[PDB]
Amino acid sequence: MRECISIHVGQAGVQIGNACWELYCLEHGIQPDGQMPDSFNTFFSETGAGKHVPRAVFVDLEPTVIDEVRTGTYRQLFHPEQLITGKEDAANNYARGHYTIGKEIIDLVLDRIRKLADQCTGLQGFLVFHSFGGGTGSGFTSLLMERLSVDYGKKSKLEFSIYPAPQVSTAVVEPYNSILTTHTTLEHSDCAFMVDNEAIYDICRRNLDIERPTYTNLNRLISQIVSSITASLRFDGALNVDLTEFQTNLVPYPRIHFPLATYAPVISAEKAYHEQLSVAEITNACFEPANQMVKCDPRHGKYMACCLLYRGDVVPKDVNAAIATIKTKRSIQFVDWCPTGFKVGINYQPPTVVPGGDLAKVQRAVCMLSNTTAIAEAWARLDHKFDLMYAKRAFVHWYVGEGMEEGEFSEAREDMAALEKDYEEVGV
Amino acid sequence: MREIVHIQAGQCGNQIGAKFWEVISDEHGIDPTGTYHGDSDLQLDRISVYYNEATGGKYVPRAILVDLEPGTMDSVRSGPFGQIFRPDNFVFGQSGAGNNWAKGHYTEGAELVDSVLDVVRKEAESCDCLQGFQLTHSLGGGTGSGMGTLLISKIREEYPDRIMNTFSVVPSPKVSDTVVEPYNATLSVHQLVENTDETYCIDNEALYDICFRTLKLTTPTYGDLNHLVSATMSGVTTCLRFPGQLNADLRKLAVNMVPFPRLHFFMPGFAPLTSRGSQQYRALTVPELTQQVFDAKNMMAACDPRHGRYLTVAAVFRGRMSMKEVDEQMLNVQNKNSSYFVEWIPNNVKTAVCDIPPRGLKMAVTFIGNSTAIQELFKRISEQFTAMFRRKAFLHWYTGEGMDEMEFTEAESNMNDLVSEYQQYQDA
Amino acid sequence: KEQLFQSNMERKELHNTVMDLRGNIRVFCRIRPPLESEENRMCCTWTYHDESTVELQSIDAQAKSKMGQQIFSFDQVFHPLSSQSDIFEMVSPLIQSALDGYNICIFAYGQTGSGKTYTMDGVPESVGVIPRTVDLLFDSIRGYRNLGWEYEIKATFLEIKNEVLYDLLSNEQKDMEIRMAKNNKNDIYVSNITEETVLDPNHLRHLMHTAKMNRATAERSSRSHAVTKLELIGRHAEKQEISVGSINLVDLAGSESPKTSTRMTETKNINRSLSELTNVILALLQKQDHIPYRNSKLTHLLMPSLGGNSKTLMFINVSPFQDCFQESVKSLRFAASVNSCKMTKAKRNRYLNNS
Amino acid sequence: KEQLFQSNMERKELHNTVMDLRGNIRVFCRIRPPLESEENRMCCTWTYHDESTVELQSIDAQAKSKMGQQIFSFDQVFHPLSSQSDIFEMVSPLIQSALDGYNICIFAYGQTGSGKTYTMDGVPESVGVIPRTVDLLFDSIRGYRNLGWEYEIKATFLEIKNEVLYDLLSNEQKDMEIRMAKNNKNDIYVSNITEETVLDPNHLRHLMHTAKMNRATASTAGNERSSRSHAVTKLELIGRHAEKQEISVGSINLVDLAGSESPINRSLSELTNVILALLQKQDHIPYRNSKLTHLLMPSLGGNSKTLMFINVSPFQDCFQESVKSLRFAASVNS
Numbered sequence A: 001m002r003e004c005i006s007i008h009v010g011q012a013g014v015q016i017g018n019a020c021w022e023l024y025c026l027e028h029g030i031q032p033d034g035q036m037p038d039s040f041n042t043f044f045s046e047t048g049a050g051k052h053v054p055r056a057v058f059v060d061l062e063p064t065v066i067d068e069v070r071t072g073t074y075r076q077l078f079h080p081e082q083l084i085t086g087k088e089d090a091a092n093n094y095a096r097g098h099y100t101i102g103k104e105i106i107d108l109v110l111d112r113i114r115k116l117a118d119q120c121t122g123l124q125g126f127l128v129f130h131s132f133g134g135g136t137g138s139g140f141t142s143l144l145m146e147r148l149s150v151d152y153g154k155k156s157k158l159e160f161s162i163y164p165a166p167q168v169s170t171a172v173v174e175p176y177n178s179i180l181t182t183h184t185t186l187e188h189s190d191c192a193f194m195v196d197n198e199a200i201y202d203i204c205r206r207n208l209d210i211e212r213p214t215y216t217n218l219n220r221l222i223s224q225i226v227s228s229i230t231a232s233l234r235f236d237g238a239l240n241v242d243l244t245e246f247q248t249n250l251v252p253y254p255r256i257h258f259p260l261a262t263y264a265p266v267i268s269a270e271k272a273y274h275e276q277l278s279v280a281e282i283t284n285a286c287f288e289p290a291n292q293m294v295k296c297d298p299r300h301g302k303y304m305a306c307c308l309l310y311r312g313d314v315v316p317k318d319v320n321a322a323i324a325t326i327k328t329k330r331s332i333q334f335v336d337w338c339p340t341g342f343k344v345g346i347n348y349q350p351p352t353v354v355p356g357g358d359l360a361k362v363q364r365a366v367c368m369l370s371n372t373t374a375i376a377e378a379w380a381r382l383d384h385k386f387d388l389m390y391a392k393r394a395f396v397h398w399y400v401g402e403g404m405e406e407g408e409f410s411e412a413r414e415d416m417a418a419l420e421k422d423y424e425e426v427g428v
Numbered sequence B: 001m002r003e004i005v006h007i008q009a010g011q012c013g014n015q016i017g018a019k020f021w022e023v024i025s026d027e028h029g030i031d032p033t034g035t036y037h038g039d040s041d042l043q044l045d046r047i048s049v050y051y052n053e054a055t056g057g058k059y060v061p062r063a064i065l066v067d068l069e070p071g072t073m074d075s076v077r078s079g080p081f082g083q084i085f086r087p088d089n090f091v092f093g094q095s096g097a098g099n100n101w102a103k104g105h106y107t108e109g110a111e112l113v114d115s116v117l118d119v120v121r122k123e124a125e126s127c128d129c130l131q132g133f134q135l136t137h138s139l140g141g142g143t144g145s146g147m148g149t150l151l152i153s154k155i156r157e158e159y160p161d162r163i164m165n166t167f168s169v170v171p172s173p174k175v176s177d178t179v180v181e182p183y184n185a186t187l188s189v190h191q192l193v194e195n196t197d198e199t200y201c202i203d204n205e206a207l208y209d210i211c212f213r214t215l216k217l218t219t220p221t222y223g224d225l226n227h228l229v230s231a232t233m234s235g236v237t238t239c240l241r242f243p244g245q246l247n248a249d250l251r252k253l254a255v256n257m258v259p260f261p262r263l264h265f266f267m268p269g270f271a272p273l274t275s276r277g278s279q280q281y282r283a284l285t286v287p288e289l290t291q292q293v294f295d296a297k298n299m300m301a302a303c304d305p306r307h308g309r310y311l312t313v314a315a316v317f318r319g320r321m322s323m324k325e326v327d328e329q330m331l332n333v334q335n336k337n338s339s340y341f342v343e344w345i346p347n348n349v350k351t352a353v354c355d356i357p358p359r360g361l362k363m364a365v366t367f368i369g370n371s372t373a374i375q376e377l378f379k380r381i382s383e384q385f386t387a388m389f390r391r392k393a394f395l396h397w398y399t400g401e402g403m404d405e406m407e408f409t410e411a412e413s414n415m416n417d418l419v420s421e422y423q424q425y426q427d428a
Numbered sequence C: 001k002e003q004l005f006q007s008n009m010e011r012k013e014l015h016n017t018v019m020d021l022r023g024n025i026r027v028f029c030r031i032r033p034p035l036e037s038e039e040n041r042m043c044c045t046w047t048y049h050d051e052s053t054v055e056l057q058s059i060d061a062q063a064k065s066k067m068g069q070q071i072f073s074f075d076q077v078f079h080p081l082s083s084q085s086d087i088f089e090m091v092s093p094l095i096q097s098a099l100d101g102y103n104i105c106i107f108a109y110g111q112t113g114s115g116k117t118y119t120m121d122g123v124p125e126s127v128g129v130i131p132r133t134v135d136l137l138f139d140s141i142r143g144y145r146n147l148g149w150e151y152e153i154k155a156t157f158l159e160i161k162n163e164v165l166y167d168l169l170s171n172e173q174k175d176m177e178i179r180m181a182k183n184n185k186n187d188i189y190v191s192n193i194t195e196e197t198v199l200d201p202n203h204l205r206h207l208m209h210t211a212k213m214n215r216a217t218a219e220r221s222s223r224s225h226a227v228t229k230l231e232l233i234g235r236h237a238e239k240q241e242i243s244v245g246s247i248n249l250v251d252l253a254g255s256e257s258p259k260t261s262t263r264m265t266e267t268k269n270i271n272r273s274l275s276e277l278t279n280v281i282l283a284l285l286q287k288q289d290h291i292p293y294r295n296s297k298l299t300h301l302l303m304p305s306l307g308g309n310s311k312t313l314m315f316i317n318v319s320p321f322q323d324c325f326q327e328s329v330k331s332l333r334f335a336a337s338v339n340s341c342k343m344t345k346a347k348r349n350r351y352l353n354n355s
Numbered sequence D: 001k002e003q004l005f006q007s008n009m010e011r012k013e014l015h016n017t018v019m020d021l022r023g024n025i026r027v028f029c030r031i032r033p034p035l036e037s038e039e040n041r042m043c044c045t046w047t048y049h050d051e052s053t054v055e056l057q058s059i060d061a062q063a064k065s066k067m068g069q070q071i072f073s074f075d076q077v078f079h080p081l082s083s084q085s086d087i088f089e090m091v092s093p094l095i096q097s098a099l100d101g102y103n104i105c106i107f108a109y110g111q112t113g114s115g116k117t118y119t120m121d122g123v124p125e126s127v128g129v130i131p132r133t134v135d136l137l138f139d140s141i142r143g144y145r146n147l148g149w150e151y152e153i154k155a156t157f158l159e160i161k162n163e164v165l166y167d168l169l170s171n172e173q174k175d176m177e178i179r180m181a182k183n184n185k186n187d188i189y190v191s192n193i194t195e196e197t198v199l200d201p202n203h204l205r206h207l208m209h210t211a212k213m214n215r216a217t218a219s220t221a222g223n224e225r226s227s228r229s230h231a232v233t234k235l236e237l238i239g240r241h242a243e244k245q246e247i248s249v250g251s252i253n254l255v256d257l258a259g260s261e262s263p264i265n266r267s268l269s270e271l272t273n274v275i276l277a278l279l280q281k282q283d284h285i286p287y288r289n290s291k292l293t294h295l296l297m298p299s300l301g302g303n304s305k306t307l308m309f310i311n312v313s314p315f316q317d318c319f320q321e322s323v324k325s326l327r328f329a330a331s332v333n334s
């Protein structure tokens, strides 16, 4: 059994995982208590009794999010021991969650994930859900992810860090958190799927067409994204691409591992009636210049490779025809080294939606994953923001007073700068 | 559970704290007796961070009431929600500092701060985890200002990690009720900025005009001023004590509002400021609420933002609102108030939506800005100080209490230093 | 050859002058003899382009693909074969300037095992800067008794740790505050400090020895700040003048990043010191109108030593090893940055007692 | 031999570095001992505050208490017991720097009868700055010969009285103008001047004697011509190394300033203003406002070294001008 586990940390990630597991239970027909009136073997750990506990440990320095899932219907699904709490969060400080608080907390989660790995027949990887600007999403996760590489590393850790919103930085110190976490993630990051909240807002305005969508609505979009992403493992399909193949398919370079997610059927129910939900139309939708989950210009970005998690009533034959036209599209640009990265994880399992789910339920779906150099500009602006703040040493006192060092800040800066050079070098 | 302990100093501090705990009890449905009669069990979710349960639903407010004249506390006994305190907490003196900071710091104030520290620390280990100290007092009188500084020194040395969210009423620019307040406030803020990390500027005439004109009040009784500051004070921590989509705490804002150690004074605020019956002439909504929260008319001190720049802002938005509309609103204010905005630090905002709104009020926010507009306030205070210092105007009261003009000169120098920092970073 | 020796010796004297005369901040990069165990574990490469310029090549695996020539030019670069006298001959003219009536401050910057105590304390083996400068100062004092100047020495020992000021001379827990003097706004003193009048070098040795046991009793030594203030007053009865000078021996803590083997609060205080120092020195390089001297106790205590009438030294104790190569080169970057820094003009203290 | 003078070259170079680091413009005060014809002259109360400061007091108690403090600090103070070697001890580093490609200015300042002339010219019994400088210069050139450096001395003698330049080496009166040098816009030259080439100290001694004779000194004979004129003697050093090039061009400008006592002051006041502006690091220096400052413009730059002597008469009747000279000197130390 190709069983895999997921971990959740920070305000962003615990709710993300909750919505993700909502769809997982929806397609596994499992109740919040954990009974299914198979496909959950990889995720929901069916015990001796009728209890399918999904492999998901939710650990945050702030216990409020653990309390929210405890009050959440999936209180039974989310094993209470898997729900690791804390006292103070990590502020907006990677150093706080990397050298003072999360530094000892990771060990407790290490026991949780390693015991889950013992129960697991064949661990595939780690679905870490978090943000970049988040203090716990930065230091705690970066130390947790790097410790996972120390513990195993062989497992295809599928990093899922929410890209920090550029237009509005929820944290004024988001740049530091983002660059510092990548400084301690890029080296151990097997394949980091990237999603920006602002891009989801734009999708909820151009496709979902929701005037007032809460974060739960963003999590619902991510829920469908990860449902299609792991659909290959949970459900058989024409071509099942797992986390191991995801790494080979998405990341072609040891440092170049930041593909942006993309869901074709993110249109509203009315838009679903407006469209014919054609395989070709949704292929174009998942390759539209404004479906990238990160604030980047895909047309100007060379795509290392695109992984389409096609699912539902779709055949690779129609996908090949549709993607062939997209390959000819001049707007779609791939790196000269790999200009034919059109590998598609075609599956024959129709995507379900949570009752009341914002995303329209479509008979077919495709989770396009494009590792493009367009995100180099996004990494550049993140580095630039950190540079101007670090230039006059702003908020550095907090980090250094939490185990950070100005030398490490400079290392993070050159690491990100070198990553941009790697991106453009892959493009040309 | 990251509890917080409350300190009261001076009659202003005691009265504002009284109304503050009344407001909190309203929030958590706490009877004046101490027994819980609210309906939302979520009121008991973090009730421990303020109300330590004693016995049978009787929750002791975690309050320390300190003064050198018994009259205020006697009123507290007579006043409702006074008997709700455990009477052991009312640790007070008899003579009175007499609006003399030196008296409040070496005379009766010394003995009482010495006498209460034991009680407050006992309450401290009575709690599980601690965050900080609110020295709810004022700089108007020598007592609360002095003993508070004596206490803050003891509080800081014994609990340096704790972040002291002390609230103070800055001496009015026009209403100099205390003739020696230039000397007093200055002596206080010397030691404060030496130790503290977050103060506030509240002007009696500022709230006077606010209630007169924005609120349409005719009798600005101190009750209104106490209620206004108490409401803002509650909103500061509602993110901590209550769940929300994006939860913050004292630590978040503590590490977010201070680019530098010393530069740690802030201007608070709240919204909306609807009048007695203005419900018709506008329609209550979060756009208009944001619109009228960031204007100088909705400030808190006489510090006009028309002479300073918002270095950082920490808007909380207690309730349920739209992350988008706040994003575009901060965008718009950044565009229009870029002049009154630190260009050196971009992307400065701390949206921290907290789900539960205030009582009977659907929508609310508490503005907290580190605007570089205090330097004029410190300038006028330093001017008053030096004007009363050229002739040592009524210096005999202080010098006679075993004190020297040495510290007066040093405090004036440090206040000049704060002015220098504010102007230097506002310009640069 | 005799004329050749005179010429080269005169030029060597000019070398000593220019360094301090121009300065005004003498950043010194001294490379200690690499420890054999740490050598065979892992070591980096260094080449001295001249006596004052060092290039810490490394360029092995990560420095190979990420960085180039680590050539950094300074005031003086010391070989691992350099002796205590070799680093001390350049301190002697500055000690002469201090006894002339100038304030002098000394910093020892480095990580754990760098050799900061071997510079200042001198280490049990041989002697260090402190005993050598004591002997030199006493010799110059008797020389100026032959010149008619009577000098008194005041010694104050202070230790800075976890933001709490500790008196190295007394074990009693006392509340320390640092404050500018009433006579002048520039000079700053510390209240309730154990002040003693030095009578002879023997008593000074005894008190230094006791203070060093108190320091060791208080791995805190590698991570705690030691401040020594030696105040000298020179009375000339015939001239009716008083010459006032101060010597500030400061032992900095390890500048290493937290990594794993570190505690929270001590690391936070070290970050206070290093970050506030970096910010204020950068502002000085920036020619900023205001320099925030009152963010940390360190810069406030040495406000005269950093922004007043004083001449201050940088000693960059660097371990020439690849494991610490990144921290070492960061130290060299900061040392070059402060080499570019400027000190407020020092002022010789002359006070005529005619009135 | 070669290594000896190579070390000497490095040594003298860093010596000029120390000199520039000092800031040059060094001010010194010299006091002349009373003569046999001035034993019946009222002196001043000279109490010596060390060898770097001196203050003067009037004997008149009615006036002593009415002037307050008269303390003035210097880099070095010369007493009447100081011999000419003591004054020359601080000229030799400047001459060595001049040999290195730097411009040196030697100035003597004070009232008539202070001793400026014998500070610069001196007597046959005790030579002044000029003979010691030329002897040391020729010895240095003889030393430089061993490393291949070929030094040629070009001496020019000129006098400035009323902002008009006069040549002291020829009686053929001409019109001489101050003009910017052809190969250097910062360097200066004066046209029609007799630029003789010095071969030995005897030749320059003869040239100085001829210049003095043609000067027609009247400092004491009517107090008309010599007492109100500037005696500017320029020594130029042009050293050329074979197979090394890298020529060193330096000049020595020893100027005997005219009397500073109250009555031309047109050049003296401009020189004072130029020196004060140089001490203040002023962006614009009024070099062209006078002939004397314009002539010495290339020799008053940042790299150039300026030397100042303040000679004062220790007499009561000279007190009112001695205090003015000491105040002018104190405009430098503060």
Ligand SMILES: Nc1nc2c(ncn2[C@@H]2O[C@H](COP(=O)(O)OP(=O)(O)OP(=O)(O)O)[C@@H](O)[C@H]2O)c(=O)[nH]1
Pocket (backbone or CB within 6 Å): A009, A010, A011, A012, A013, A015, A016, A062, A089, A090, A091, A092, A093, A130, A131, A133, A134, A135, A136, A137, A138, A162, A164, A165, A170, A171, A197, A215, A216, A218, A219, B245, B246, B247
């Ligand atoms: N999609 C989505 N984004 C969220 C959610 N909650 C927070 N975020 C995003 O997370 C960022 C804010 O950081 P937080 O997630 O609060 O930080 P954290 O990971 O909890 O770590 P701390 O800063 O230590 O509290 C912003 O980009 C938010 O938009 C959520 O439920 N869904």
Ligand SMILES: Nc1nc2c(ncn2[C@@H]2O[C@H](COP(=O)(O)OP(=O)(O)O)[C@@H](O)[C@H]2O)c(=O)[nH]1
Pocket (backbone or CB within 6 Å): B009, B010, B011, B012, B013, B015, B016, B097, B098, B099, B100, B137, B138, B139, B140, B141, B142, B143, B144, B145, B169, B177, B178, B204, B222, B223, B225, B226, B229
């Ligand atoms: N906002 C507010 N300010 C008050 C109130 N009562 C007093 N003040 C102000 O605070 C000052 C009292 O300072 P405090 O330290 O309490 O006085 P003391 O105890 O007599 O030394 C007064 O002079 C007023 O300026 C009140 O109820 N509300």
Ligand SMILES: Nc1ncnc2c1ncn2[C@@H]1O[C@H](COP(=O)(O)OP(=O)(O)O)[C@@H](O)[C@H]1O
Pocket (backbone or CB within 6 Å): C032, C033, C111, C112, C113, C114, C115, C116, C117, C118, C123, C222
């Ligand atoms: N020149 C030297 N000769 C011999 N040993 C040295 C030298 N310099 C440093 N060391 C060694 O380095 C070690 C560091 O000691 P110390 O200076 O007390 O700690 P730190 O270097 O961290 O301040 C000492 O044990 C000492 O033996």
Ligand SMILES: Nc1ncnc2c1ncn2[C@@H]1O[C@H](COP(=O)(O)OP(=O)(O)O)[C@@H](O)[C@H]1O
Pocket (backbone or CB within 6 Å): D032, D033, D035, D111, D112, D113, D114, D115, D116, D117, D118, D119, D219
């Ligand atoms: N150091 C000295 N020793 C002896 N006599 C001196 C000294 N200095 C000046 N005099 C005398 O002062 C007289 C005036 O000459 P001097 O003052 O040098 O001319 P000037 O007024 O041009 O400077 C001379 O006759 C000389 O004898």
Ligand code: ALF
Pocket (backbone or CB within 6 Å): C111, C112, C113, C114, C116, C117, C221, C222, C223, C253, C254
């Ligand atoms: F090891 Al140390 F000062 F760094 F004693």
Ligand SMILES: [Mg+2]
Pocket (backbone or CB within 6 Å): C116, C117, C221, C222
């Ligand atoms: Mg040590």
Ligand SMILES: [Mg+2]
Pocket (backbone or CB within 6 Å): D116, D117, D219, D226, D227
């Ligand atoms: Mg003459």
